[model samples]
Each structure stands twice: as C-alpha cells, then as structure tokens.
Target chain A: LVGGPMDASVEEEGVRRALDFAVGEYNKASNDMYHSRALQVVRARKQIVAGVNYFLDVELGRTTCTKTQPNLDNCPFHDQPHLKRKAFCSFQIYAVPWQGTMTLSKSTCQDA
Target chain B: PRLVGGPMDASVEEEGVRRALDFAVGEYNKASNDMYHSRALQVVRARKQIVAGVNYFLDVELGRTTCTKTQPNLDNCPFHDQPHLKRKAFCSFQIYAVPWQGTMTLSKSTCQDA
Candidate 1:
C-alpha cells in the first residue's frame, strides 16, 4: 500500500481507507489458512528540526522452520536433505520534523 | 627654549616604529593561520587513524616541504607534498569491505600491524 498527496481535510480519511483495505485483504487471505495469522502495526516518530514532526507506521510478521535430519545433505521437501520453514512480516514508521526531511524512522516484526 | 632632539631625528624614529609595527602584525597573522592549519591537520589525522588499515598516505614534493620516507623502492608511492598543500596538511579515511555470509563486513586489521 502507498500514500499519495492529499488535502489536509481528507488526510485522516485517506489513512482510514488504506487501513481498511489492508485489513480486509488479510482477512480474506486467511480464510483458507490452517493456522491464524495476525497483523501488528508499529509506529515511528521523527523530527527534522525544532517544532517540525512527522509519523509513520507499518505492519509485518515472522516465522522460522528447523530441519531434523542430521546426515541428509539436501532435501526435496524433507528427508532427502532437510526441511526448514521460514516466514516473516514487518511494518515500518518514519517521522520527520520538516515536511521534506526525514529525522527518524523505525520498524517492527511479529510472528505469524 | 631649545629642545635636545631635532625634528629630523623625531621623523626618523617615527618611521622606524611604523616599520616595526607592520612587521609585528604580519608575524601575528601568520601565527594565527598556522594555528588554524594545525587544528585542521589534527582533525584529518584523527580520522585517518581510525581507518588507517584501508588507506595509504602519499607524499608530494612541491619544493615547499621535504620528503620524509625513502627506501629501495623510491617510486613505490608518489612523491608529492601534502594533497591539500594550501591547507598545509592532508589526510583521508577509507574502509575496505568483504562479503561474509551474503553480507558485506568491514575488513579487520590489527593496530600493531598497521
């Protein structure tokens, strides 16, 4: 998802629309899943200079799989080599004091 | 009333004092620039020390200063004065990178080896 230039009056409304779209997509995709996956959002604050500040937020997830076979050099799916699973998701936020300058940003990830 | 010193003598002495003042001011200004140059050199040197392993110093001789190091391989490095001669000194920093586990990491060196 992305943000575009917006009028000041509709800025909040735009954010709301973006969030709703993202949540709806996640819910739709999870309907066929064997396990439930959750989305977590992280926020960041940044200052470009005195009296100017901006904020950004993101959402993500993470997972990992381990292999049990000791002697197998390679695995097709599991036994021949080894099996491992990996997963990840994350969100990021950026903040700036000036509209054009980014002062700070951060990101966070969660397990799915 | 008659004074011991004549007008001519006073004029000569005044001229001498003026020359002395001019010389003193010139020397003072040179000293000030020298101080600034020294401080700038220190800053460059400190940065170089941090990244010494990755950079080699070159000397350029422009007749204003003498070359310090010499060896069998006289041409191993360029012969020139400091890179920034106008500022009286020059130094640089560099970091070498190598791939490690699909990521790049800075080359490691020992202080004693440098």
Candidate 2:
C-alpha cells in the first residue's frame, strides 16, 4: 500500500536506534549540560521510505551524567528533585542503515 | 479531498530522521557561502507524509562550528567557544524520498539567522 502507516514495537533494534538518535540529538541541541534518556516509549510507527522513517512518542528524564561523559546509556536518571526533570516527546527519524546514516526530522517535547 | 497526514514524532534518534537530517545539513552547508561548516543542533519540528513515496518536512536549528568545510568528521566538530563567534540559523526544509530507488531529495529549504 502507498502511504501506509505500520505499527512498530519499541523493542525493535531499529526502533531503539531511532529513539537513541532522537535523545542524542536532543542532548546535542539542549542547553542543559546533562544528557537525557528515554524513560518510556508511548508509541511508535514505521513507514517505508528511501530507507525507513520512524515516528515515536517517548518520555525522557534528565540523567546524572553530563554530556561530557561517554556512554550516555550508562548514565542514570537524576533522583534529586532539583536536578530531576522529565518531558514527553515526539520524534521522527529517517534511517539508511546500510549506508550507516541516520537523520532526525522532528522532535517536540513538553514537560511531563 | 480528505488529507491524510501522519502523526508527528519527536525523536531525531530514528535512523531515517538521522539520515534525512544529515542530508539536509550537508545540503545546507553546501548552499551556504561561509567557509566554516554548520551542524544541526536541533530538529525543532518534523513530519513525514506518505504519498507515492514519502515526504519529510523539517524545522532545524543549525550552529556554526569551529571546523571548516574542508575539515573531517563534521559530527565531531565542536561549536565555537567564544560567544561572539557563535552563530545560529533556523531552517525549514522539504525533502522527498523514493524507497524503491533508495533516493532522498531535498525539495526545498529556506533559512534565516537565529
């Protein structure tokens, strides 16, 4: 079918990669020194494109570690109230895995 | 006619988003007259519409880095440390994709200083 939407599982490797890319890009653009990680995936969709486009709704929370740190995935979420923050975000990503290329199309987030 | 639009996604982490943004940024860099390269800081907005293939509309925030266009590793390039040297631009882009052909084209892009 043309222009069809397909449900996607958050657990898929491609989906996880897309989520990580969005969060990483978010960290890159955000003024906050600390990095944020996905807390939950509310929804996900996949569309066929030149490669594939992924749409995702995810919850994000600030982490204890700064962007300076490596392996952001290892960083834990901040437990301190003042340092703690969360947001619900929608992200659109395009991937060409064979070419080793991924790009972010959109990301919108609101306080959670 | 009824319009079919897909819901918005907020993550740039998805591979497709990442690829398209990379293409957009690359094109933006080439389109610019500046000597230095700029990288996308954020995807402020994005949407993918399915038609015959796929269509991507993106709002991106871009920042100038210390590295020049001739430099290697745009991904690792860092932004200028000096506040005075820091520059930003906001761009709106329309991109089209053909899955069968494995092609992505930049349909339209416009930008202004931010």
Candidate 3:
C-alpha cells in the first residue's frame, strides 16, 4: 500500500532485516577508528516501491572492538564513559529481496 | 509565504544535496558493473522540488578511479590517469526524499559518456 500505516515495532522480521542492513552499510561507510553497532532502533517504517523501501531512525554506539573486527555481533559497547560514543541516524534503504539487492537511498546522522 | 510543488535551486554544499549525490554516484557505479569504481568529479546542476516531501534532481560528471570493488576505502581512492583507462560519464539523477520521515528513493538515473 502506498499510504499504509507505518510499522512501529523493530521486532518485525522485515523491520529487523532493514535495521541490520542499515547498520552494516553504516559501518562500511563510517571508517571510524573503532567499530560501532546499532544500540537501538528508534523508529522503522516500510513503503512498497517496485520492491520495498525501509525507513529507519537508529542509535549507534561505539564498541570496544576495532574496525578490523570481522564480526560485529560480538562487539560490545565501550564500558568507559569517555570512550562511549553514540550517534543518531536516519536511513532509507531500498531493497529487492528476490534479486538480493539493497541500496542506501539516504543517510544522515548527528551526535547523540 | 508557505510552499509546495515549486522547484528551487540548491547549493551542492548542502547536506541533503551531498547525500543525494552520494546515493546517485553509488547507484551509477553499481549499475555499471565495471571492475573499477567511479566517483563524481563535479555536480554540474542541482534542483530541489517540494512535493509532499522533496525531490533532488542532479547533473553530475564522473571519472573512473584506480580503486577496485574490493578496495578497503573506495572514497579515498584516486582517479586513473592512463589514456586507455581514463573515462568519464555525465549522469542525470532524481532522488526523492521525505525529511520529516527520513526516506529517500532514486526516482531516476540516466548517463552518457562525457
């Protein structure tokens, strides 16, 4: 539906996938000294384009893991207060599941 | 006065314009399927349209880079200088976005050799 109500929960399968995709893309583009992962998904929405467009507002926190870390799922957030870094970001991801294509349409972030 | 539907010029320095350009250039490279990556050398034109949300229409010139798809940081890669390898393309793109809701779509993309 073009004008359907938004999905409010991050637990939804599609919503979760979008969040993960957004975080992965974010990490790839960031190139920060340290790695970071999604701490929370503030909001999530989906729109049906030719495929699907996912809209996400998320909070990302710096982890103790370095950028070289191959797996981010195991990375933990910085325990030291000064090392703690967070950013709030808005991301739009366009996806075609059958074709296995996901592109970042938009992303803007600010310090949290 | 309030506004809707009027198309307006925009600075390439604007955050939204930069984001749109990044998305456009990335899409261009993805579609090319070439071995090396390419990047926008210049933004020749930019416009913003106000609908329920907003739309960015851009004209950009791209140049081939030395970096391959597997490069650790494509953004830091330099452009190629070899005559046979050197290549450039002119692209026109339209990116629609909803600022309040934080959504964007690549509504159009077309390109030709420059």
Candidate 4:
C-alpha cells in the first residue's frame, strides 16, 4: 500500500500523475514479488487492479472559505489529530490491489 | 329752306331708331330667356368661358397690382346666334319614356328628350 498528499486544485493532473506513479510502483513491486515464482503475470494487469482498488477507497470533501478570498479555506480533516492544521490545498492518494474477481459477466439465457 | 318731305323725315328716322333700339332690346331679352332656359348649355359654356378667363387673368395679372372688373353679356352675338333658337333644348337629352294605359312612365330618356 502506498498513500500520499496531492493538491486538489491540480486534482486532474495530480490524478494522472498519481495513476502513472501507481502503475510504475505496482509493476515494480509485482516484478519483485513474482521474481522467485514461475507464474507469468503481466505488470500492466497488476497496475490496473492496483489503480482501480485505490480509487474505490478514495474520499473527497469540500471546505468553507472567507468572503474576501473565496475557494481559499481550511482542510476538512484538520480537526482530526491525524491531519495537521493545513489549509484547503491538496487531495489524498492511495494505492492497493483488488482481492476479489474484477470480471463483469453478462447473462444471455433470456428468450429473445 | 323749303321743308319738303320726300320719303322719311328726321322724326321718321328717330322713330326708326327707336324701333331698332326696341328690336335690339327685345332680341337681347329673347336671347337672355333662351340662355336662361337652356341653362345646362349656357352654364357649361359659362363655366368654360370663366375657366379660360380666370386662366388668362392669372397669366396676365401675376405679381401685378391692379383692379379691373370684367362684365360679360352672354346673350347676344353679332354673327352667330345659339343653336337652340326658339324651341326649348331638351335639358336631359339621354332619358327615354314608355306610354302605358294612356299614361307615360317618366323615365330618364323622357326627361332627356324633354
């Protein structure tokens, strides 16, 4: 698992960068983990699964700002001891692999 | 001087002059009646004459300061008398009438031919 802070203002770019970083890291980790095993699993598959699972657990929250400077505010999680008193500036990123089946099945048993 | 009366004297000439004057006055009066009776034609002629006269006055008296009265006696003409002489000119010459049961239906043509 890997987690990091990202600027919510640059969320789109940050998400892209984070996705690229997650793919790279997952491939590297999977390569190292499966080096000793004989099974051949593509690193790209591991990267996709890791990225999708990480996106599922992600939470987004808004904040209140001052009248003079709208969109400038304190972080929502600032009151928690886990999150320091940082202004509403960034987003959060998490990376994990899917443990269950990620396949989608369709039923064709119905009469036309 | 021997006052010898051959055919006519001064008195006779004077009487003839008076008769001529009377004749002239009678002719004028007759013409006036004719004109007045034939009012349709006379009015048309008078209107045309007045129009022409007014046109002439405008053309001649334009921007000029003068006053003159024009008196026109439309009864007598020296050479040519009006076409309708004695008999009344039919005021409306386009109407027609039909006689029924010893009574005539007064139609437009009847008035016209009157």
Candidate 5:
C-alpha cells in the first residue's frame, strides 16, 4: 500500500531487479572468466535528496559457477560473502506520471 | 537509536513515511494556489520507491493543480456532476491506474454535448 512518486515498493523492485540485471551480466562474464557468480545486494537504502537515488550495498557470499553447473550453492562462495569486493550501488529514477510510477532513469554499482 | 536499521523497526519506518506524505497532502490541499503558484501545480500523487533500502518512495503529490471534468474534485465543487457547473473544464484526462490517477469531475461539457 505504501506509494508515492518516491515510493520504496518500486525502488526496492528497482534495486532487486537491478541487482538481478547486474548479477546476470557479471554471471555471463564469470562463465567465461572462471565460471561462477560472486555478488549479492546484502542490504540497500533509498534517499530523497540528490534527486532521489538508491544505495545498494553488496557482499561476496556466493561462489563460482560453470556454464551448465552455474549455481551458487553448487559452486561454493555461496557460503558467507566474506570475500573482498566493492559493496555499494547508486541510482536514480524519474517519475512516469502516465505510468503512475517512476522509472529508473540511471544506475551504477560499485567497482566490479 | 539508529534512524534506519539495526534490525530496523519496519513499522517505525512505515509510519514515519506515511505521516510525512499525508501531512504534505493536507497542506497542498488546503491552499494549492499558495503551495504551487507555478500555474496550477498541486500534489498529484505519491508512492514508495525503495531506491536502495525501504528508505524512500517520495512520489509526493505535486503537479499542475487543475480542475477539469473527468478528474476527481471536491464533492462540494459546483461542477460536482455537471461540466462547467461553476467553472471551466481543462483538457481531457485519461482514467487508468490501480489507484486511478485523474478521476471524474464535471468538465465543462454536457451529456447531450457528450
């Protein structure tokens, strides 16, 4: 029920989807690079200042994955994300009034 | 003590946000002209956007405050049911949204003139 231009429902969905998108991209690379996933948005937050943006904090909890065997649990590193990695994400959204919601105008995560 | 997390009191966050937006809506409603003097701008809508965490969803209702038919207006409005009841109607507003954006108002048009 929580809604508004800056509503978190969409924002959460944004980051959730973003993380999904980013992870998927990197995962594809990992398949070629050693083969396994290596990231997760452990926690995140959204703010109203600086033109409305999201902060995604990530952690290295999962392990590597091969093409067919691409699975976190199956590869390990899937344990606790105690590995070294940049754990932050930032992004903004612009309201699409016609859509009755906002759209992710831009987004970028910490160093890979 | 922490404002956001530390096992985060989810309810606290929820209420705090709800309260602020609701208060703003009231403020904008009381004196839209005073609030949005930039040519009829008023609170259009608000929503949640968990940019990072459930920290914000600031779709604060602020937009061109206009009174048109097919738009939701105060019941006491003279044009409550009749277009041009007391004032003029603006452009056509499309009705669509789960919560519904612009709603029915007495646009300066008649059923026969429909």
Candidate 6:
C-alpha cells in the first residue's frame, strides 16, 4: 500500500499509529516520575476492537522512545531492555481520531 | 472509597475518604476510551450573582476521576466545555447546607443535570 507498510493494512496502521502516539503522549505526562515513556508494542490482548469505531484495549509493553521517535537505539533507555514497564492503556480512538495531537484526555502510569 | 454509605471498618473508611472525589468519577470512567478522557468536576468557588434574581453562581471546575459500569463511579466526559453540555446547580444563601430546589445553569463545564 502506498505510504503504508504492507505487513499492516491501512486499518491496522491507523490502530498502530494511535497506540504509538499514546505512548509518546504518555512520555509527555507529568504525573509519573518513576519511568519515562516512549512507545508501546501491540500485545495479543490489545488486538481487539472491544467496541466498534472507537478503541483497542492497548495492552502495551512500555518501550523506549522520544518525543520525536518510536522507541529505538541511542535513546536513554535503549541499553536496558529489562527496565521496561507495562501500562494499561484504555486506548481511545478520539471522537476526532487522528495521530496528530498526541494529547490524550489523560494518560498516566497504573503499571509495573 | 471502596464502599459507599458505609459503617465501614477503619481501613475501608480511610480509603474512601481519600478517594472521595476521585474514586466515583474514576470508576464511572472505566467505560471511557481514548475517544474521550475521563475528567472530574472541580468546584473552584462560588459567588452570588444576578441571574433570575441574585443567585449563587456556584463557580465550578473540573479534573479527573475514574469509572466503569459494574463498578460505576464515572460518567460521560465530553471533549471540552460545551454550552450544550451545561449543568444545573442549586444554592441557598441563607445557609451553606440549605437544600433547596433552586438551581443555576452551568454552561462552562458539565452536562445538563449531569
């Protein structure tokens, strides 16, 4: 698909983009002081719609990333993979669904 | 707190008191998806103003509380302050705790009768 990765359909890309955006948004959160956030990988649990045209339960394994990129190398937490965290992202597909804002109504860490 | 309308044990009483404002709202918010983030109603302050007559414009504010249905402590949190989402409130100047049917329409935050 043009401008879209072949492995994930455009529909999948939309969902994945929201998940990644959620983590980056979480990174900007001021509430949690324990671990910084970056991005999340889709887990088997987060793969469901749960509700139509709205959300994915976003079972995310906290990965390392920056405000600019997905969790990747040279980022501060890259070297220590085990230092990862898990967050229960009730990932919402905003009434206006787009990855542009990266601003959640609320994004916090109730995770380990 | 964990249970409402309680003659609860000391431990449970402590938990409820702490979560008083945030808990119910938080529980009701469980149903919320990123579609809308759960926001709690914050009451900033209040003042008597001329509306129908001199009335208590109970100044309100908002923040976050959590929610879910079976464990309901939440409700629909709209995207932002919407006049269409206005709420009705009541106050009696005679006394701080005077319960009455008098109310003022709140337009900046909350929903109608919500």
Chain A TM-scores in order: 0.22, 0.50, 0.53, 0.19, 0.25, 0.29
Task: Tell me the DockQ of each model, to 2 decimals.
Answer: 0.01, 0.03, 0.02, 0.00, 0.03, 0.01
Considering the two chains of model 3, state its CAPRI-style docking category. incorrect
Model 5: interface root-mean-square deviation in Å:
29.6
Best candidate (score: lDDT): 2
lDDT of 1 by residue, A51-107 (tens): 111111211111121223243343232222232222222212122212433222222
Q: After superposition, how far is residue B8 of candidate 6 from its true place, in Å?
A: 39
Off by over 4 Å in 4: A1-11, A31-112, B1-114
lDDT of 3 by residue, B17-71 (tens): 5655556544544443233343443455555543243344444454555665455
lDDT of 2 by residue, A1-112 (tens): 3344466665665455444445445445545343333434555555543345555444544555454445445556566687666555555556545456555566554664
Report the poorest 10 consecutive residues by lDDT, candidate 4 chain A: A103-112
Q: Candidate 2: TM of chain A?
A: 0.50
TM-score of 4: 0.11
Q: Tell me the lDDT of model 6 at A98.
A: 23
Question: Which pairs clash (backbone N, Cα, C closer than 3 Å) in model 3?
Answer: none
Off by over 4 Å in 3: A1-49, A71-73, B1-114
Alpha-carbon RMSD of each model: 40.0, 26.6, 26.1, 68.3, 26.7, 28.1
Compose the digit string of candidate 4's lDDT tens values, residues B6-113. 222123124322332233222322333122111010100000000000000000000101111122442322321245421111111111111111111112211111
TM-score of each: 0.14, 0.31, 0.30, 0.11, 0.22, 0.19
What is candidate 3's DockQ? 0.02
Question: Which candidate achieves the best TM-score against the true structure?
Answer: 2
Interface RMSD of each: 36.1, 26.5, 27.2, 64.2, 29.6, 30.5
What 10-residue stretch in candidate 2 chain B is worst by lDDT?
B1-10
Q: Give a tens-digit lDDT track for model 4, residues A1-112.
A: 1122222322333223333333233323331221111111111110111221100111122222222343433424233454322211111112122332221111111111
> Between 1 and 5, whose DockQ is larger?
5
Model 3 Cα shift for residue B79 (angstroms): 59
Error of 3 at A56 (Å): 0.4
